[PDB]
Amino acid sequence: DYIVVKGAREHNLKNIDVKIPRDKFVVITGLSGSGKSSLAFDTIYAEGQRRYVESLSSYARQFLGQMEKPDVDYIDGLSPAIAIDQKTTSRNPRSTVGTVTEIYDYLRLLFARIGTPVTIGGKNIYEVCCLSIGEAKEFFANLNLTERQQLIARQILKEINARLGFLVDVGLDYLTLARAAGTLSGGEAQRIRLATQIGSGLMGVIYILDEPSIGLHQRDNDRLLRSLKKLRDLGNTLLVVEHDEDTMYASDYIIDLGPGAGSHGGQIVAEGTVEEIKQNPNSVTGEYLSGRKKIEVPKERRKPNGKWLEIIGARENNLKNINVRIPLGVFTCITGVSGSGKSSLINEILYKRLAAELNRASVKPGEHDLIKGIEYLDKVIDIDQSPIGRTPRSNPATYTGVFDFIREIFANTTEAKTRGYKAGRFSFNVKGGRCEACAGDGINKIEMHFLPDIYVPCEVCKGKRYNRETLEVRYKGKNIAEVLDMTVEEALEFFKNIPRIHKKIETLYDVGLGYIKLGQSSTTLSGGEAQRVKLATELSRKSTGKTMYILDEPTTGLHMADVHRLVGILHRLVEAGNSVVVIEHNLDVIKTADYIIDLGPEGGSGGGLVVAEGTPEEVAKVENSYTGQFLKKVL
Amino acid sequence: DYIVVKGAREHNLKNIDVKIPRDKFVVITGLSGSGKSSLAFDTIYAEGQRRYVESLSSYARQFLGQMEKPDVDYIDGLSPAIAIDQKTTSRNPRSTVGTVTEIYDYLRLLFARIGTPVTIGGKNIYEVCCLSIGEAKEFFANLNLTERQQLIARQILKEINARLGFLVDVGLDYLTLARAAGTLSGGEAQRIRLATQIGSGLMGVIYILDEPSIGLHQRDNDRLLRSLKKLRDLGNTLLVVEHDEDTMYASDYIIDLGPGAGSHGGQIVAEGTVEEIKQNPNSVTGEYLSGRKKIEVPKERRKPNGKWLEIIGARENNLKNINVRIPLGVFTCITGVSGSGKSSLINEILYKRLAAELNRASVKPGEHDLIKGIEYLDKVIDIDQSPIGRTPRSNPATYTGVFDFIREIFANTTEAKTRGYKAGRFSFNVKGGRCEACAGDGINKIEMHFLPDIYVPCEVCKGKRYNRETLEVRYKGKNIAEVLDMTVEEALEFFKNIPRIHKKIETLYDVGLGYIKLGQSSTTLSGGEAQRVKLATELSRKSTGKTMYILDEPTTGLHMADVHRLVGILHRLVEAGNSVVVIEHNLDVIKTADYIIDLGPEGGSGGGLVVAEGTPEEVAKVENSYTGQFLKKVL
DNA sequence: TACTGTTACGGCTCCATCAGATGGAGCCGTAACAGTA
DNA sequence: TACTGTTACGGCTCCATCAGATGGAGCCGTAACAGTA
Ligand SMILES: Nc1ncnc2c1ncn2[C@@H]1O[C@H](COP(=O)(O)OP(=O)(O)NP(=O)(O)O)[C@@H](O)[C@H]1O
Ligand SMILES: Nc1ncnc2c1ncn2[C@@H]1O[C@H](COP(=O)(O)OP(=O)(O)NP(=O)(O)O)[C@@H](O)[C@H]1O
Ligand SMILES: Nc1ncnc2c1ncn2[C@@H]1O[C@H](COP(=O)(O)OP(=O)(O)NP(=O)(O)O)[C@@H](O)[C@H]1O
Ligand SMILES: Nc1ncnc2c1ncn2[C@@H]1O[C@H](COP(=O)(O)OP(=O)(O)NP(=O)(O)O)[C@@H](O)[C@H]1O
Ligand SMILES: [Mg+2]
Ligand SMILES: [Mg+2]
Ligand SMILES: [Zn+2]
Ligand SMILES: [Zn+2]
After folding, report:
1. Is the CB of B424 under 7 A from strand D?
2. In this structure, are A532 and A502 located in the same domain?
3. How far is the CA of A464 from the centre of ligand 7 (A)?
4. Which of A118, A143, B458, B598 is deepest in the core (most CB within 10 A)?
5. What is the torsional sign of CA B112, B113, B117, B120?
6. Under a CB-based contact definition with an 8 Å cutoff, are residues A267 and A257 in contact?
7. CA distances from A400 to A395, A502, A531, A534, A537 (A)
8. Last residue of a domain, one of B486, B510, B534
9. Which residues of chain B lie closer than 8 angstroms to A109, CB-CB?
10. CATH code at B471?
11. Is the CB of A90 under 7 A from strand C?
């Protein structure tokens, strides 16, 4: 009736002991970097998978793969578990919806077993693969096959029906089975990934979902919550790590981590129901949910100064030749149901034309007639909706670009000048100044065949990634290993008189990563930490006073405090005289915008029109828009 | 704390509900054919494996394979399970001890990871593979490697040490790692199979062992029981299906099935401790253990009549050029520790020479000088230690040889003579008289890719395996489908006036298979049922009054009642004037023998000498023999 | 002449056993070119 | 002359993703040959 964990010390967990109720809807909350993933996916799921795998033969074990042994003492009440990872999965161009959701395999099995020589219900394999999800489901629900075929193909038909029912329930009935998985939107790809693993329900199985609401509108999130509630009612346990308020409100139990991030978190601050979390002063999530701490809606919203960006004849993808006016110099939020065509408009027309017109880029934009009002802009800065790549040869210092300046100033010292060194000597990714016994890695990763990998630190350089010859040159009493060793606050104090480094380090501090180390590997970063690193990298660039910031969903992996900090940064940028355009599903970011352009009313072929246009108060007066309904509810 | 099963109806289970204690030594007893395997390996293990597999992806599922869904309602308290099947596994000549026990893989991993360029402890891969188990274990326990190598290769060394420790504990220290697995004795192969799956212990794992004591002496069984007790004390649950008295006496809980076999069993008769089972009148196992029912030791043992079989210079395999005298006309039991060389003597010299001398066979015997006393014999009948092959095209009627006579008498009828039919028309394995829609199978087995197979009965012949044209000819009002449909008692009454069929059917009844059907598939037979079918096939042959019966472990898969029946049959054969020689580890069979030849004192290179020779009472006076010690204990 | 052993020969079925590679995409470091200030 | 965009190019690393085959052994059915009784 419980999953009891004792002595969990993985990553930054501070020897925490927790009890998780079984056959319930449990939600794990906390700040970005608290340790929710290290507790759910890296301890419980890892222990369950290892326990299941250890009972199999070596031949099967070397195919399935063994996870790393978690640093835990005793876990009880486990069971078979299915986990959905937080990180998004890229797709090859060949993979389609049917291939990804494992529907084509069942289709081939059915056609091979009860096929009529290649005719089940009066259709062939291509005629049934090239249909929308809703009509394919209604076709498969009206299959008049014989009794022998019914007995033979019971399981295949049941699996197909369950998968199609889930895909219809989430709201993806407009897609077909032949649509390429690599061209779907963020929310559609997230829902397809969810349906791949959770479409066919089981019994007595723990489901661990790490942020299952990427690029999902509130309406889509409600349908996903209904499906999750049905799956839990099927006799299962659900462990969902989320930052969404609706997910917490729709859960039986809440486990709150914190109280901070990195080395200041890894603990348990509060637990109980939603009201219990709200009443706990030590819980930051409860403080933000109870209204004690909140993002303040402006009393007066900025008005356009007469300069507008007019997009005429926008017909890219599913856009139905619409005209959109984006005011300049204010904060504008682009809203719509997942798949309605907000990314395909903004990121594929506005940014792709602004870059060519201003930054002298060579990227072909989408299908549009013309854009007017470009002359009121100087440069464009964009943040994509795609995640960042993770390599052990990467860290926040290299990603943001300050490591180049640090290496240059290290190579400009007196001793380095005497020895004839350059900036390439002070990097652990170039031969000449790095330890060759570890190739600048610092630690050695030994990979076994079927056993979990073992990490052993290097002994020649003691994990410093550099040899003594390169470590013999120091700047202000510190060598480059100590430079990579200090955190962002220490580096901010260290380089306070160097504007070039100080600007980017101050940006990193302002996005909320002062605790992080300059040399922490990208592979060991968190989702929110990587998102904020990308945000700081893009926002650390120089602003000319009349510049456009285009952000495509910068809320992913961010707690309420993090989005509050980002909102403050964006509002300061707006007050500086720049124009900020944000494609956002987060309603807290939306409620502070001075202008809203809403698209819909549906996704795919059912959307692409400007349902609403104006200030949030005016949009809330429109009953057609779901965004308007939610805005009216929360205003 | 329990494994609760409800509504189990697999095979012949009569909707039984049981509760199995956890972290205990549980033994399941009952008659041959009661349903112990169908309850342990076909319900609990099947459900656990299916539940674990269903949580994985299709790619891994179609590699691991899905077991058939058991006919059960609700099973709780499950966990990862490791099962050892009752049926023995044949081995290719290429496989060795290290390959089978998964020790070579760990050896290669260690040599690749901490090798010194190919030198770990001062030895190479061949110099360490070509050693006995004890010296290899003592070498690996004295490895003076460096600290970095110690940290790197901790798990590999731990696994190797645990496997070698188990192999030494069971008593196989005289074997090597390069020894071919296909040339081992029955007990040695059984112990190697056990060590493959149970050598490295785990925690919180259910172990299901189906008859883990094939070809094991009492001394070897004691060591195996000690190892099993240690493994259970490591925090595990053990479910052992056994007929051995020592295994029941060394278990915390006993679950008894019955009260019979086939359609007369499948229930639960009693449960509790050993004393509780003994005190239950409805429990046949308790009745045999408590002494109410027993095999009666003869008051006076038959003496040799002056005719002996002298084997001079027996040096085959591990035999040390020994001389053995086997009295003729009495019951002689060959006893010894597993590997001492009883099979290599008897089956490889005595039978292989008697067959050539009497049955005009062309099989080359082993290494011996000569055998004297052959002229007092007319024919030899042998039962091998190997199990029988299982095919769906097989049944007891075809195996024993009565189906040929039945087909001949069916083809000799008036209507068959008029139509010009032959015996080949009345068989479901020859084209012409069988249904071609199922190829004489009766049912169709549809195999999926990763889903469990589905069985659908044929519709053209309704599962009768024959068409209407072949079913239109009947003998005594019954067609051949009804002939295959009746049980052995019905066929015994049916063919009471036909001596040829009646002899074999009476033999089948006498071995205890009167309930079984003539047409039951061999693949669906039980281990004890197959053993008794082979015994009846070999014992149904004509006896000339002076003939030698050689039986190599005919007790496998047989309860105490079955071995009592077999002992009675063998004693009747002896009283008929024939000579019976039985290689037996069962002490109840041994105590009734009129002569005993004991070999030992150890296995492999440590045995091959006649430790004792004489009547069981005289052998019990020798302290050298473990067999003598047990005989003294039980006499 | 029939019962009882052996052998071969064709067809059918069960079981052991082995121990990832290739294409796609992102990131670091370096160089080159161009527009402003 | 310096700060800030773009592009290319080499090297390194992470991730998706596909959808068993072959040799060995036992058994049924049939035929042929031989030793007795
Ligand atoms: N190897 C490591 N050693 C120590 N700390 C680590 C290591 N890897 C990650 N961390 C830190 O451990 C903290 C928790 O990581 P993680 O559990 O992934 O965060 P999270 O709670 O899921 N955050 P988010 O996904 O953004 O909501 C973060 O501050 C990481 O930077
Ligand atoms: N390359 C493409 N070819 C065809 N259709 C596409 C392509 N890319 C996207 N679409 C479709 O265009 C519609 C709008 O997608 P897009 O504009 O990217 O989504 P969005 O509204 O921003 N929603 P989301 O990203 O989930 O928050 C969806 O139905 C997509 O499936
Ligand atoms: N498909 C089937 N349908 C009905 N009965 C079956 C089937 N398969 C096997 N049986 C019978 O079910 C009974 C129990 O089988 P099984 O569980 O294998 O026996 P067991 O208890 O392990 N006996 P043994 O191994 O000799 O000690 C036997 O009489 C089988 O002949
Ligand atoms: N072909 C072979 N070549 C070499 N050694 C062999 C061979 N067959 C058996 N041995 C060994 O000879 C010894 C005696 O084996 P064997 O006589 O078959 O055993 P047994 O005494 O009858 N015991 P068991 O069959 O387990 O009850 C063992 O050490 C075997 O490993
Ligand atoms: Mg996370
Ligand atoms: Mg059995
Ligand atoms: Zn090093
Ligand atoms: Zn048929």
Report:
1. yes
2. no
3. 7
4. B598
5. negative
6. yes
7. 9, 12, 12, 8, 5
8. B510
9. 448-449, 451
10. 1.20.1580.10
11. yes
